[PDB]
Design a protein around this ligand. Structure first.
Ligand SMILES: [Mg+2]
Ligand SMILES: [Mg+2]
Ligand SMILES: [Mg+2]
Ligand SMILES: [Mg+2]
Ligand SMILES: [Mg+2]
Ligand SMILES: [Mg+2]
Ligand SMILES: [Mg+2]
Ligand SMILES: [Mg+2]
Ligand SMILES: [Mg+2]
Lengths: 84, 136, 54, 177, 104
RNA sequence: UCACAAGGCUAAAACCUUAUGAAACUCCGAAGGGGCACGCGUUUAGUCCGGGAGUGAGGCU
RNA sequence: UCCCAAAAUGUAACGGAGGCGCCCAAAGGUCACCUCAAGACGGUUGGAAAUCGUCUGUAGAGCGCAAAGGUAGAAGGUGGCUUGACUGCGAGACUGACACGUCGAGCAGGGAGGAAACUCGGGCUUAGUGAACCGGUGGUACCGUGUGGAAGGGCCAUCG
């Protein structure tokens, strides 16, 4: 006549969002200590003027202007060059 | 028929047929015309039809193959509580894709064995014959 | 954390300096077995090494 | 030692045999490598002690315990535990132990008529491991417990197998024909 | 095997350091100890040892350390970074060091 | 990586030609989108401080 | 953590899979050194797999645990010395309705490793967590009800 279940899911679950990616893009002014990429790994390597926290977070060290170096795929660098 | 080990469940979407529209392994070939789903048993049916009509032995190339799991919820359940559990298997045959290749048989034989397979099929078809040397 | 705590325990590293100051971290008892001996700063002087008080 | 000079008298022998445009472009001998892979079934600390002793007393050089590559198949295997014993001999002590071998080794071998002449390192080298230990200059059954055997691997800097072969034999070596 | 050299090489932060890096090459019985401003593709000072050597083969390290550092006085170089090679900072290249490390 | 069509080859795997599927494959990879600078060119909004809210059942293509 | 998620972030479902509520006194700091899986030829126990050698070998391995990204000029394997798994702070950003959360240059005390430039305020990273309240404990001498004490509170630390 009717049915009695009984099944469910073992799924559903997921994890709260991890707002990643670059926050500071090609040709952008930058204050000292402004963050420029959140990333899982070495996706973007620090160049001149940019350091890297343990989160592999890239944060700029001395003001200036942001510049993206794509060195042919899998090896890429972000840097600051000050204006003048 | 089935695949042997995998992941389990899937989805659905469509546009025209990737590869391959061309006639390898044989002299005569049967081609989809419609964006169907094709179940094992439907092929199984075409295989057995053509296999009988050719008797011994001819040569039969069943190009298409059901890797796609389709599910169906239990009988009389209110939606949710889960995803349906693998009812059967389909092969997402898009238009122009060649489903069948037969060779070692006359044109007549090929026509017939084809037509017979066609009437067992969810979708319109067309037979054709080589020249498609995009590669080999 | 929780009571049962068989491996790893919150130990407190109290100074020899007799200042009052201490620290806290965790030791496994599988590998420390006896005691814990560490050399950290003291803010009531400058840098005087502590032992694993209960 | 003396053996070195004999190599240096094999050198114009192979220069003359092969017509080499250079004297360094002639087959030489790089290291000797002694392996002792008991383990797996022999998990005894006492036994690897004994292999250490035996090896140190014949080869006059300390031996390394080459552990398990951490491959743990169905049968008896595991992570990081003793399974083999290596002693790499090159240069002086190579020549000393090797002369000990042609001199007192294969001669004192129970039922001996040469070794396998069919090709080895088709790259151009040559190994050959050798069984029993009760056939020795230094090993005695009157200074051990049970009975074992080992592995031996030379590296002829040859370019093929005929040239390796030649070097080996004219260095003083038995080829069972 | 090239790993030691490219290792310490990248480990010398090229430009962003500011200081100048200082090559060596004691593998042969001749060296080359160059002084480089990294960034600019240019090599500043330098003091070899194959244009007469006195005679010493490895004893002369201190000599070319002192000779180099001597060139460094004139050109005006007071800051440095020690770009070793596959060379494990011990004797010879340590001599070249200590030598330049006082005779600047 | 997982799956898969005919054949070769070999003791089956690997490998060779032919051939193909993929949300949780990717050698690649658009259209589009997003950030920043200008306004090189049109137009009108914006932002902040303070008072008053209501809304938090949505519906179809 | 991955897919859904429509190549910026974000995005629901009783949608599709899988882990966590720890662990490490070395698996941390620094210094120095080493390079993987796998197949082929030949090798005493072996002989599917053991241990040795030669050749190939950009990752087809490893990273305590899930997976994703990452990584061979090391994060991977080994050794020396070690307690930065440190106090007093925090320019400036990421991120959230709030409370939270995350990254962090640089200054001081004062130390570790290095010959040194230097690096170190835990762990390749992302889970290993609990706001207040009332209470335990070590320091502190801020308040202490006529005054001087003491009970009691307050502060920093810290445990449930
Ligand atoms: Mg191409
Ligand atoms: Mg509501
Ligand atoms: Mg609502
Ligand atoms: Mg809605
Ligand atoms: Mg989008
Ligand atoms: Mg919503
Ligand atoms: Mg209350
Ligand atoms: Mg108190
Ligand atoms: Mg009190």
């Amino acid at each position: 006549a009717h049915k009695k279940g009984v099944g469910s899911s073992k799924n559903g679950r997921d994890s709260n969002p991890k707002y990643l990616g670059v926050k500071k893009f090609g040709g952008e002014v930058v204050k000292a200590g402004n963050i420029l990429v959140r990333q899982r790994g070495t996706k973007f390597k620090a160049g001149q003027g940019v350091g890297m926290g343990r989160d592999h977070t890239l944060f700029a060290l001395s003001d200036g202007k942001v510049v993206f170096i794509n060195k042919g795929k899998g090896a890429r660098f972000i840097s600051i060059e000050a204006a003048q | 028929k089935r695949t042997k080990f995998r992941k389990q469940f899937r989805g659905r979407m469509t546009g025209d047929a990737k590869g391959g529209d061309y006639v390898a392994f044989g002299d005569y070939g049967l081609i989809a015309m419609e964006p169907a789903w094709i179940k094992s048993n439907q092929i199984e049916a075409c295989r057995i039809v053509m296999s009988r009509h050719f008797r011994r032995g001819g040569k039969i190339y069943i190009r298409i193959f059901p890797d796609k799991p389709v599910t169906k919820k239990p009988a009389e359940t209110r939606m949710g509580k889960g995803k349906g559990a693998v009812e059967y298997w389909v092969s997402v045959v898009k238009p122009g894709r060649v489903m069948f290749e037969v060779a070692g048989v006359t044109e007549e034989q090929a026509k017939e064995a084809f037509r017979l397979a066609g009437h067992k099929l969810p979708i319109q078809t067309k037979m054709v014959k080589r020249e498609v040397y995009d590669e080999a | 954390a929780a009571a049962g705590a068989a491996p790893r325990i919150i130990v407190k590293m109290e100074s020899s300096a007799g200042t009052g100051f201490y620290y806290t971290t965790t030791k496994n008892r599988r590998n420390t077995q006896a005691k814990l001996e560490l050399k950290k700063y003291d803010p009531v002087a400058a840098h005087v090494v502590f032992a694993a008080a209960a | 030692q003396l053996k070195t000079k004999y190599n240096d008298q094999v050198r114009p022998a192979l220069m003359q045999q092969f017509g080499y445009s250079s004297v360094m472009a002639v087959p030489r001998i790089e290291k000797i490598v002694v392996n002792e892979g008991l383990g797996s079934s022999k998990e005894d600390s006492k036994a690897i002690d004994k292999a250490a002793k035996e090896l140190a007393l014949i080869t006059l050089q300390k031996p390394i315990i080459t552990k398990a590559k951490k491959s743990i198949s169905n049968f008896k295997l595991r992570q990081g535990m003793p399974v083999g014993i290596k002693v790499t001999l090159r240069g002086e002590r190579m020549y000393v132990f090797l002369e000990k071998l042609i001199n007192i080794g294969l001669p004192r071998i129970r039922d001996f008529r040469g070794i396998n002449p069919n090709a080895f390192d088709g790259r151009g080298n040559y190994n050959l491991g050798i069984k029993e230990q009760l056939i020795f200059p230094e090993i005695t059954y009157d200074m051990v417990d049970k009975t074992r055997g080992m592995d031996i691997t030379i590296v002829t800097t040859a370019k093929t197998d005929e040239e390796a072969r030649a070097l080996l034999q004219s260095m003083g070596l038995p080829f069972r024909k | 095997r090239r790993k030691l050299r490219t290792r310490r090489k990248v480990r010398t932060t090229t430009a962003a350091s500011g200081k100048l890096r200082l090559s060596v090459y004691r593998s042969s019985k001749h060296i080359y100890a160059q002084i480089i401003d990294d960034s600019r593709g240019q090599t500043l000072a330098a003091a070899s040892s194959a244009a007469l050597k006195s005679g010493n083969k490895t004893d002369t390290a201190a000599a070319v350390g002192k000779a180099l550092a001597a060139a460094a006085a004139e050109k005006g170089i007071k800051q440095v970074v020690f770009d070793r090679g596959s060379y494990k900072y011990h004797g010879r290249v340590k001599a070249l060091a200590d030598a330049a490390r006082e005779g600047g």
